[PDB]
Design a protein around this nucleic acid. Structure first.
Lengths: 98, 82, 314, 107, 93, 98, 82, 107, 93
DNA sequence: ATCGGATGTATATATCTGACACGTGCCTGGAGACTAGGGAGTAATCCCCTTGGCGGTTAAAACGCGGGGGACAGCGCGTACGTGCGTTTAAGCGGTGCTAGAGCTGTCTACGACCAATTGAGCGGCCTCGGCACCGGGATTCTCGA
DNA sequence: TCGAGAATCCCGGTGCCGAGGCCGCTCAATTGGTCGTAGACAGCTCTAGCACCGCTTAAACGCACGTACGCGCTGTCCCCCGCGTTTTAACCGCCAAGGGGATTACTCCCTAGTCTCCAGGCACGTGTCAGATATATACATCCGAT
């Protein structure tokens, strides 16, 4: 008889754990390659200080945390518990990102 | 040694863990790649300004101070690096 | 749009010069040469008892080559059904391919060994070289003109050698978007010109033109004429090849049991023939002179008829 | 004649002379007043004292001595006035204060 | 290259308010950058205010007004208190 | 037989008219007395330049227009057409006003 | 000559016309006085800074430039007056 | 001793001497370059031309000769890049451009 | 008291763009305030950049970087083209 | 879906102004000319940090696989709110009136600028040790079918 | 609804590298003077803000009332959570080359600073016409009877 938690319970536990934790939730090398690929739009052979790259990545990560925060807020305001792309677009619209 | 098409460097479980940090319980699939765009969009601001500073510095790489100033002029200043 | 229930235990499928005969290397080690016109058996040759991993038709549509899991490579004829040749070599073979312009040289790709071109006339064979020296999983294929051999290693490095001298006429390590390396799944060609394709393990079919490949030579930076993949499902394709006319290209999604046909010039997806979800797709090929697609799923052959607008409106 | 730093005369720990040099080289005025750098060092010392006191309280609550960035972020978010001062600021390794909405709780 | 910072002063203030409490170099750098940012903001506001009054000498009154502007409420109140006390202590000598 | 428009139609017409118009939608003297009464919290006998007072009033009016804008946005996102105080509080929360 | 309790200087139809300008169709009553608070709150920021500038100017009245600077330092700069 | 204004030398309509004096006495740097005021006046002139073009366009559209603040608001809101420049700026007598949401329409 | 402004120059550029049309006093004041605001933005960015490069001479390159930072996309492109043209015409005197 | 009707809104004309175009005399800030100094540009060198690559591990991403539960659509309802009509209130104009305080000018002084002479606070660099990261395990505590 | 079972708290032990105390070694802070001037202060002006009157009237308060949209409940159903396996490529540790970063030393071309001069800009009048306001009209639009 295999045991399975009800949906959301594991999600809530992971939420608590990650709110308690502090490390980066994005893999280093993929994000670094992404930053290089995007910077290719402005000049080639552009190097980066590693610390600068993780600083950028963590600032953008915190911005993503904040964005998910207000999307969650508008979602719980809409009497829903599942975020939807319209909610993200609404959050970015209220923040003045479009 | 040329990079391209690595926008999928951000993965679905990575975005999901990030949303969990943001306290999100349930997420629709149409969010994930959507989020990617947003993220990319964000960079196209700061990244740009970043190189611009280096563009004025007549250098060829980016320093921490550069991205700090870029985030600062965008009202998203960051501490820990100067 | 069809199937072949009379054919069972199928493992491979190949088309002759006219594509009118489909060679089916069966699970019990037999070769069913099934005729397309009569929709019936043209020949059955009980080759061995080991499943045939690959077959290959002759340029004149007369000879055939079997590669059983007994480490046995053999040559037979369509009419006599007699074992013209049989030999054993370790490192079981994944791909055998006749010389498109010669009826003596045949490429054979072993697991733990570099590809070897064996002569059908005498006991002479040429072992193809290796760049990274540690492939241990290498593919190779003759060019459409029968003048070159493309060899793909397990780290994206490709060596184009001369089919006779095996000298380095071109070389290039392809990127993977993320600038990493990827084991080459297959290197296949078309019947027209020199436009060919490489299916890789990082789910990107690269439609290249061999003219620029031969032009770049050493340390070239060749980019494909087209890029093919499934952006929404990210399916690693078990086998990919051109259509009958070559303007279109079919890829066999084995994980989800489907076929995907794109174009070449613009490369836009022509359509998707998604078979029955139950079975597991293994092989795929296109009739070289007819709009017919012969697939093989879980060991049984399925037919796909791209019938034109007639036969119901005329 | 011996020399004593202005911070010693002002009974302050932050470098008054360094703040004066920064103000001079910062192109904020043609000439900085005498007591302006003293006042600036004072207010900076007070702000640092407040934030470090809150951070150390959080650290003692976490049964640790070394103040890590998590303690700093938690202390910043655990004060209304400090938050309003740094609402547009992102702290390294900060994360977010443990917070879960109401409806997200099961029943 | 001699790189000026505030690490020693943050350490002194920490030891004052918290004797047996440690601090990480990362958190120390964050605190240093925070001091720098607050100082930049205050100096900029004071310079803008002085220019708005057509003055050319940033003095204690300018810094007091800038602090009253930037910090909200009781933070600004205790800040102006500390600044006035330090000004008194320095001017007494 | 008295005639009456359906609800919202007159509201939509007034919306169009006011979006077309430009004058201040707040009476001058009440707002001025309100500004004086609120400024009483900081110092007495404080005079004001009339132009300064209307500048403040119009800036705050435009801020109110903007706020009603995002409240309308969150309302239409909540599948509703009637703004509610929770929606205003949500808008101010997303804007970072609390 | 002392003023007080004139928060009702803003009226329900005034707020309603303002919301109409904001494109609002239907409004609940509990909004109106609520909005008032918000408005008042807003002033307690800028108004404060306003007098603060005059406080530094050693003057006794408020100029347009003062409220412009107050709105500027609050990220809500306004044009038309300097 | 041949008199000639620097604005004519740059062929512009903005006072290069005035902006140079302002950059000097505005406390932005210890020294000001020679071509920097020219360049700054040039970019200011370009921005003014860009905004006034749409301003006059809207004014003529409304059959009004003298441009009014409402036309300035319409100009800065209709443009994308200009609105991004003034994203957090309000205008005296500006108002808001005619904008009715989709669902708000009657049905 | 000669409280200066930019009114005459805005009037001139308006006449050179649209001679028939005019402009009210309030709209002229809005244009003056906008000019002052954008110019102060550019000046602040140039000063910050000069401090970041530790240079005490604001030159044309600093203004180029500042305008490329501030104005978005095609506005920045046209602005830097106009500025380069103007500075080249001036230097060629 | 349609037509008659009421209501509201766009238009032309009158015409009436007051803000606006501009013409003027005068001021002073901007252009000319010249001199000093030294921030910025150039070059040459040293080197730290970057990019690059390879091999082993596995934590993690990908895929798939049930299944329960929130999203959503429909339905009913009733309460709150637009809407029109009144009655009532201060809002707006303008008008005069007083003067408190902006606003300007003129000092004359105390206050940094600045330069030089002096030197310990502060900082790169060096040991060094213990708070803390990691871990093994065992008790502890939340959850899910009875 | 009480145990079963899985995830967490915590306790103790191991080992390490960052935090911290300490050391020469500057150079930036301090101190003492001299200079030129920023503004504090006094004093005079006028004007713009403040305050009351009264007058007309558009606008606000309140009511009645239909009505339609928020809200609450049902039911379905997709779809995303949950957890297993299977893949991979992130990571980490290490080694390599060099390439731009950073510094230092010259060198001067550029700009601050000063005095001279006048000329564009600005305060201030002065006609004057673009648009603000009223009126009658003509049309576009919502809405109920059919």
């Amino acid at each position: 008889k295999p045991h399975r938690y009800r949906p959301g319970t594991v999600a809530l536990r992971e939420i608590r754990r990650y709110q308690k934790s502090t490390e980066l939730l994005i893999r280093k090398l993929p994000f670094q390659r992404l930053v290089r690929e995007i910077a290719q739009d402005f000049k080639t052979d552009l190097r980066f200080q590693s610390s600068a790259v993780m600083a950028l990545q963590e600032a953008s990560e915190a911005y993503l945390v904040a964005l998910f925060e207000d999307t969650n807020l508008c979602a719980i305001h809409a009497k829903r518990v599942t975020i939807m792309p319209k909610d993200i677009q609404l959050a970015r619209r209220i923040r003045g990102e479009r | 040694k040329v990079l391209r098409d690595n926008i999928q460097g951000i993965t679905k479980p990575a975005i999901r863990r990030l949303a969990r940090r943001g306290g999100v319980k349930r997420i629709s699939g149409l969010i994930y790649e959507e989020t990617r765009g947003v993220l990319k969009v964000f960079l196209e601001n700061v990244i740009r300004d970043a190189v611009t500073y280096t563009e004025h510095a007549k250098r060829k790489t980016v320093t921490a101070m550069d991205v700090v100033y870029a985030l600062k002029r965008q009202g998203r200043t960051l501490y820990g690096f100067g | 749009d069809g199937t072949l229930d009379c054919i069972s235990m199928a493992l491979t499928c190949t088309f002759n010069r006219w594509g009118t005969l489909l060679a089916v290397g069966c699970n019990d080690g037999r070769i069913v040469i099934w005729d397309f016109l009569t929709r019936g058996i043209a020949k059955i040759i009980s080759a061995h008892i080991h499943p045939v991993c690959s077959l290959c038709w002759s340029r004149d549509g007369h000879k055939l080559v079997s590669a059983s899991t007994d480490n046995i490579v053999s040559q037979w004829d369509v009419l006599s059904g007699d074992c013209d040749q049989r030999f054993r070599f370790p490192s079981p073979i994944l791909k055998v391919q006749y010389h498109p312009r010669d009826q003596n040289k045949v490429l054979v790709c072993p697991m733990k060994s570099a590809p070897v071109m064996l002569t059908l006339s005498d006991s002479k064979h040429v072992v193809l070289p290796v760049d990274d020296d540690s492939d241990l999983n290498v593919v190779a294929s003759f060019d459409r003109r029968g003048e070159y051999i493309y060899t793909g290693n397990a780290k994206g490095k490709i060596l184009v050698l001369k089919t006779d001298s095996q000298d380095l006429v071109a070389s290039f390590r392809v990127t993977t978007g993320t600038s990493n390396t990827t084991a080459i799944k297959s290197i296949e060609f078309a019947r027209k010109g020199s436009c060919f394709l490489i299916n890789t393990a990082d789910r990107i079919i690269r439609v290249y033109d061999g003219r620029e490949i031969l032009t770049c030579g050493r340390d070239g930076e060749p980019e494909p004429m087209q890029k093919l993949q499934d952006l929404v499902n990210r399916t690693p394709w078990k086998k990919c090849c051109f259509s009958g006319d070559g303007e279109y290209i079919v890829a066999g999604s084995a994980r989800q049991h489907a076929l995907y046909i794109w174009e070449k010039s613009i490369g836009n997806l022509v359509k998707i023939l998604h078979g029955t979800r139950g079975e597991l797709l293994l092989d795929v090929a296109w009739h070289p002179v007819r709009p017919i697609i012969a697939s093989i799923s879980s060991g049984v052959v399925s037919i796909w008829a791209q019938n034109q607008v007639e036969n119901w409106s005329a | 004649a011996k020399a004593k730093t202005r911070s010693s005369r002002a009974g302050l720990q932050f470098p008054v002379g360094r703040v004066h040099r920064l103000l001079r080289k910062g192109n904020y005025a043609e000439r900085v007043g005498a007591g302006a750098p003293v006042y600036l060092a004072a207010v900076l010392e007070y702000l640092t004292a407040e934030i470090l006191e809150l951070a150390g309280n959080a650290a003692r609550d976490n049964k640790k001595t070394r103040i890590i960035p998590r303690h700093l972020q938690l202390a910043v978010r655990n004060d209304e006035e400090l938050n309003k001062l740094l609402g547009r600021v992102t702290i390294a390794q900060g994360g977010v204060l443990p917070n879960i909405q109401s409806v997200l709780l099961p029943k | 290259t001699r790189k000026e910072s505030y690490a020693i002063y943050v350490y002194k203030v920490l030891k004052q308010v918290h004797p047996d409490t440690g601090i990480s170099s990362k958190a120390m750098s964050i605190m240093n950058s925070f001091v720098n940012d607050v100082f930049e903001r205050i100096a900029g506001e004071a310079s803008r205010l002085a220019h708005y009054n057509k003055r050319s000498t940033i003095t204690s009154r300018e810094i007091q007004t800038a602090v009253r502007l930037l910090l909200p409420g009781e933070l600004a109140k205790h800040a102006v208190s500390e600044g006035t006390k330090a000004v008194t202590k320095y001017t007494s000598a």
